[PDB]
Design a protein around this ligand. Structure first.
Ligand SMILES: [Cl-]
Ligand SMILES: [Cl-]
Lengths: 4, 228, 223, 4
């Protein structure tokens, strides 16, 4: 997963 | 009826979606893979409600301020409300453009009653998918404003590169199922629960693995809001 | 059923009111006349909801942190929820104690899902009358693990940029509007319905813009 | 009226  | 917003207008309202995926190298911000699914899914679920949806990709700070300023200058006499969805990177009180950051409150300041007469006493909805400071994980707003943040200040806002952001996934899922029935806070509360229980982060870094996320609703609304 | 908080407990829960009226000279803040009437009114309208209301007066920052920490360490197993009301001066992100300022999030941190297990998955309400200027897992099992800031709700008397008004002889508009609606609809309306009306009542009083910050995962009825 |  990636973050903003 | 006297505790609800008057929804007896020709149209539900305008809905602007800002989809920032690619950013300039100077910002050092990576590509937000999965946001294209979000922007398209949001286009569908918000049109279903009855919104006039328009999507812009990779807007600069100047462009974002411009299109929102131009929007508030439009005639919203025969509109019930206004909605704006922001999809990008971000920190506390700010959201990322392709060429840097710009304060969120500056973006929403255009739609205040003293600058937008035709939207006075009508709900202004701002949905924001972005980080709001991650140290844990100024024009004032007005009444009839609502901010649906993807996360709580100090915490991460997660995004699946192959499915989209957790907040948008949950939002459209609830809107397609109960968007015509439930009041706006009921919808957002279910979005809160969906994000809080259905998702956990995936990473080979155990420090950033199986982390949780809770969205944040900031409501200055004075009435109840049903989309029907 | 699954969309409302379980209210089937022996008691509704504890409600702690911090009533700060007199402040030290070094704070530069004046006396908050009328806040005593707010505290007394809040005591009555919250006892009627079913809360066990406790009132503290003129608390220092260390005092505010201590009593809330102690309260978070109490056994809330047979309680439905928790409530805290703050009556004092305030700036951005901070509330005024008798001797200075303390971060609001430091006060609420004691009740996070990882620090307060007996209030886990339970509503945690914070009502704040003031100006606003201008970490472990809750469970080892991923299936029961929830965000630590979940089930929190904040009811501010105003927003940053505007003032929070208080009548020296009567009290704040926010408290009066809050108690009035709680008396009439505290047992039949959902929490957001109540607070939305509160926002309207203070708005039609005419600036002051009350708001609600909700991290709730269910609907809240005081039953 | 006073402010907080
Ligand atoms: Cl994408
Ligand atoms: Cl007094």
């Amino acid at each position: 997963d990636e973050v903003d | 009826a006297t505790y609800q917003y008057n929804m007896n207008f020709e149209k539900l309202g305008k809905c602007i979606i800002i989809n920032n995926k690619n950013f300039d190298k100077v910002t050092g911000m990576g590509v937000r893979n999965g946001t294209d699914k979000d922007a398209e899914a949001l286009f569908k679920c918000f049109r279903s409600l009855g919104f006039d949806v328009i999507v812009y990709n990779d807007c600069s700070c100047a462009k974002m301020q411009d299109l929102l300023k131009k929007a508030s200058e439009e005639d919203h006499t025969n509109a019930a409300c206004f909605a704006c969805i922001l999809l990008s990177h971000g920190e506390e009180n700010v959201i990322y453009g392709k060429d840097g950051v710009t304060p969120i409150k500056d973006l929403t300041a255009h739609f205040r009653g003293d600058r937008c007469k035709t939207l006075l006493e009508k709900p202004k909805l701002f949905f924001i998918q972005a980080c709001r400071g991650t140290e844990l994980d100024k024009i004032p707003v007005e009444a009839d404003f609502l901010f649906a943040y993807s996360t709580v200040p100090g915490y991460y806002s997660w995004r699946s590169p192959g499915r989209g952001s957790w907040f948008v996934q949950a939002l459209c899922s609830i809107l397609e199922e109960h968007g015509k029935d439930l009041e706006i806070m009921q919808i957002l509360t279910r979005v809160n629960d969906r994000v809080a229980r259905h998702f956990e982060s995936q990473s080979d870094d155990p420090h950033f693995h199986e982390k949780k996320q809770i969205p944040c609703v900031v409501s200055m609304l004075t009435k109840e809001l049903y989309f029907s």
